[PDB]
Design a protein around this ligand. Sequence first.
Ligand SMILES: Nc1nc2c(ncn2[C@@H]2O[C@H](COP(=O)(O)OP(=O)(O)O)[C@@H](O)[C@H]2O)c(=O)[nH]1
Ligand SMILES: Nc1nc2c(ncn2[C@@H]2O[C@H](COP(=O)(O)OP(=O)(O)O)[C@@H](O)[C@H]2O)c(=O)[nH]1
Ligand SMILES: [Cl-]
Ligand SMILES: [Cl-]
Lengths: 472, 472
Amino acid sequence: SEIFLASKRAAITYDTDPATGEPRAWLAPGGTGNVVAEQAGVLNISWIASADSEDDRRASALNPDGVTMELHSGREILVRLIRHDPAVFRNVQNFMTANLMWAANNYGWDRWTQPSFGSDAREGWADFGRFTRDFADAILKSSAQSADPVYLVHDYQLVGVPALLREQRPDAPILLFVHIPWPSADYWRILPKEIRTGILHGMLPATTIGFFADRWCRNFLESVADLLPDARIDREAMTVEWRGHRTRLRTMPLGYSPLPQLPEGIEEWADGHRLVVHSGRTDPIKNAERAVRAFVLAARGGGLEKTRMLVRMNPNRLYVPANADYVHRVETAVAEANAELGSDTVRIDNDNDVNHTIACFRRADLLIFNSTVDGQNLSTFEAPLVNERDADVILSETCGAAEVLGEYCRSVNPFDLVEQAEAISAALAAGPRQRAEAAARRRDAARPWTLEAWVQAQLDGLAADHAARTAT
Amino acid sequence: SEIFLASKRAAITYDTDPATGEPRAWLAPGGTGNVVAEQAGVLNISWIASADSEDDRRASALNPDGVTMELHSGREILVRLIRHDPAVFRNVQNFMTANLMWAANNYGWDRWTQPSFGSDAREGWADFGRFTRDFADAILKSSAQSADPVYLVHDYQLVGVPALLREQRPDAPILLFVHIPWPSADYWRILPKEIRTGILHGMLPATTIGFFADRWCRNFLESVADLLPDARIDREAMTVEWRGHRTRLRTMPLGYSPLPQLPEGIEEWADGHRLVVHSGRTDPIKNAERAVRAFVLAARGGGLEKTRMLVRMNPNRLYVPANADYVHRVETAVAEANAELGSDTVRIDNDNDVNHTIACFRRADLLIFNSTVDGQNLSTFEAPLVNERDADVILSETCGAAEVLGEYCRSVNPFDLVEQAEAISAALAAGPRQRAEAAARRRDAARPWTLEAWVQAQLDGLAADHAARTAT
Ligand SMILES: Nc1nc2c(ncn2[C@@H]2O[C@H](COP(=O)(O)OP(=O)(O)O)[C@@H](O)[C@H]2O)c(=O)[nH]1
Ligand SMILES: Nc1nc2c(ncn2[C@@H]2O[C@H](COP(=O)(O)OP(=O)(O)O)[C@@H](O)[C@H]2O)c(=O)[nH]1
Ligand SMILES: [Cl-]
Ligand SMILES: [Cl-]
C-alpha cells in the first residue's frame, strides 16, 4: 500500500550536529507521517507539505522531488516541500485566518455588522485556487509512478485538493480530514456564493471526509443539502451522492499522542492556593475572557478564598486583529478580576512552551476548557491524563471533545457566565473522594483515543469506503 | 366555532368624536382579529392582548372582562387587554429586544465576544414566566364558558403560552404562529439551558406551530432534536412527538394586506434622477449600512450618474443599543457615500409615516430589501405591487419572503458587498421592456399572498392538525 499524505506543514527541525557542526534535517517525532509509516499495511509513504520557512525553501530547492528521511525501526518517509509563489501563499494564509475562513468555520461573525465581503474576498478565493493547484500538482507528481496510490489529505487549507486529485485519478482512495468544525448551513452560507459552493465542490470528490465530531458531519451534510440542489444526502448512512460521486462522511475522534518545571514564578505564586488553570492559544475560540469573568462570579459567591487562577496562553497569529483583540479582552478581564478580588489573584502566562503547559496541567486543581466552539480540543484529553491532583474538568459542550468526554466532565454552555460560575464553585467544593473517583473515570474515557488509533481509523475507514464506492 | 386570539398587541385607536367630543375607542382596520372575524366558519371571536399604553390601562380597568367592539357588516369582537405588573412587563419587553431574544432569533451574536449571560438572563426568564402566566390566565378566563374553544396564539412573546393552555384544556386546538425566524440548532443553543429548553417546552404542546418559511420550520425541528432527547422528529412529515404531544409544523407565508405625497423635499431632490430606495425600520437586520456600501461600490463602477439613493427608516426601539448603533452605522455610511460620490447623493429619511413609505415604493426605480435575515418581510411584496416604474427588487436570500419571490427578484447574499453592487448595476442597466416583463411576473407571484389567505391557511391547517392529533 503506497501512501501519499498531504498536509499544510510537515514538522521538520533544522539544526547543526553538536559534534560535527554539519547541517542536518530531521522529522519531529509524533508527526502524522511518522505514525502512518509504522502501520502494518503501509509499504511506503510520501509526505507533501508547504515550505513555510527559509530553511524549508532552501531544502525544497535542494531536493525538489523530495528528500528521504529516516525514522526509528529503519523506516523512512519521502518528504517533499512545495515552494508556492510568496504573494499567493501569503494571501492564502490571511484567507485562512480569522480575517476570513477561520471566522467561517469557528463561528466568529455576528451577521448584523460583520462580515462584509469585498473585492478582497474574490482575490483571496482566486489565490486559494492557485494554492490548491500547486498542492494537487505536487501530490500527483510525487505519486506518478505509483499504480494504486492512497491519498490522505489533511487540514482545512487543503479542502480544494480532492476534486483535483479525483480529476487525474478517478479510482484512487482519497480521504480528506478536516480538523476544525463545520458550521450550520445558515452560517456556512454567509460566505460568498463562489466560495460557499466552490469549497463543497472541492471536497465532495473525496472517497471519505472525516471530522472530529458527529455535529460537524451533520452540519456538513446540511450545508450540502442546502447549497447543492443536485446533491442527495442521507443522514443515517452519512453519505452524499452528487454528480456520480458517492462520498462517505465519518467521525474519527482524536484525543492525544502518548508522547517538568512550571513557568518562572508560577509555583511560588500558586503555593498555598488551589489553582484554576485555563489553557489555550491566543485565539478567540478558547474563551478565556469568559472563563475569568465566570471565575469572578464564582469568587463573589465565596468559598474561593485561597484560590488563584492561571490563564495560560500560547501566542499564535497575533497579527490577526481578532487574536490581538482577544488577548486584549483577556488582559482587561484579568486586570478587573484582580482589582475586585485583590492583587495577584489571576495571572496570565503567555508563552510558547509545551513543557510549561503540561506542568500547568499537572499542577491544576481545576481545569477549564470552555471554548466557544472547538473542532476537538486535545488539551482536554491531555490534561486529565497527566493531572495528579484529581482536578475536575469544566468542558464546553461545543468542543468536539464533548462528544467523547462530556459525560465525564462538567459540561457547560460556554456563553453562560452564571452556569460556568456555578460549575467552578461546585468543582472546588467537591471532596477528595468524589473527585478521585470522577478523575479515574475521566482518565479511562480519555485513554483509548490515541494518535495511533485515530490513524488506524482513517486507514480502515477509507478502505471500507473505497470498497463501497467501487461497488457503487 | 368560537375563536380566541391572543397576540402581544391589539391595535386600538383612541380619540374623541370630532362632533360630540365624546371619548372614542375603535379597532384599527386590517387587524388580525378583524380578518378572522370575517371568516365563514367563525361564530364569534375574542381578542386578548397586553395593555401597553395609558389609554389601554384605563380601558382595561374600565372593562376587565373585555369590551365588545363593532366592525363593518355588523360583526363584533370582544377585546380584552391585560394589565401586567409594570416592572415585569418592562423587563419582559427588554428580554424581547436585541438585548436578548431578538438577537437569539435574528442572528445578532458573534459568539466570540457576545453574548455572556449573567444573572439578568435568569431574572428576565423568571419575569417571562410571570408574563406568560398572565396571558394564559386571561385567555382561559375569557374562554371559560366556551365548550369547544379554538386558540390562536400569535407573536414570539407568547411562545410560552401553548403549554399553559394545554394543561387546562387538553383537547383544544391550539395554533402558535411565530413571525420571526428560527435559528440553526447550534445557534439557538447559545441560550442558557433553562431558556433554550424552556422555550421548546412552552411551544410543543400546541396542535400546530406555524412559521412564515420552510427554513424556520426545519431549524425549529433541528433545535428540538438537538435539545430534547425524548423528542422524535420527522423531517418529511414536519412533526414532533414528545411526551405524548404530537405537534405539526407548518409554513404559512404572508405577503401583504390589500388595504400619496413623498416626504418633504424628497420629490424635488429625486427629480431628474433614478432613485434607489431601501426601506425598513431602525433594526440591524434591515441591513441598510451594507446596502449603502454596495451602492457606493456600484457607483464607483459607473453608469450610476444621475442616480440617487434614499434610506427610508421607521424609528423603532431606539433605546436598544443595537438599534441606535445601527442608525449610527448607517449615518456614517451615508456621510461617507456623499463625501466620495458628491454631496446629496444619498439621503436618509427617518420617520414614522407609512403613507410616506408607500410613496417611496411608488417612486422607486430600484428597490432593495437586503435583510441580514427576516422572518418574512412584507415590504418586498407591497413595494412591487404599488410600484409603477417597473423597479427591479433586490432581495436577500435570507428573508422568508425569498422562498416565495426569490426567483422573481435579484436574490443576493446580504453579506457580499460585491455581489450586491453587481446586482445594483445590472438592475439599473436593464432596459424598460425587460424590467416591465420581470415586474409583471413579480407582481403575479406576490399578489396571491394576502392577509386573508394567510388567516384561512391558519384555520384550515389547525383544523386538519386537530383531526390528526385527535386520531393519534
Ligand atoms: N507549541 C506549544 N504547544 C502547546 C503549548 N501549550 C499547549 N500546547 C499543545 O497544543 C495543543 C493544543 O491543541 P488543542 O487543545 O486541540 O487546541 P488547538 O490549539 O486548537 O489545536 C495541545 O497538544 C497542547 O498540549 C505551548 O505553549 N506551545
Ligand atoms: N408605522 C409605520 N409602518 C411602516 C413605515 N414604513 C413602512 N411601514 C410598514 O411596516 C411594515 C414592515 O413590515 P416588514 O417589511 O415585514 O418588516 P418588519 O418591520 O420586520 O415587520 C410594512 O407593512 C410597511 O408597509 C413607517 O414609517 N411607519
Ligand atoms: Cl446559523
Ligand atoms: Cl450556527
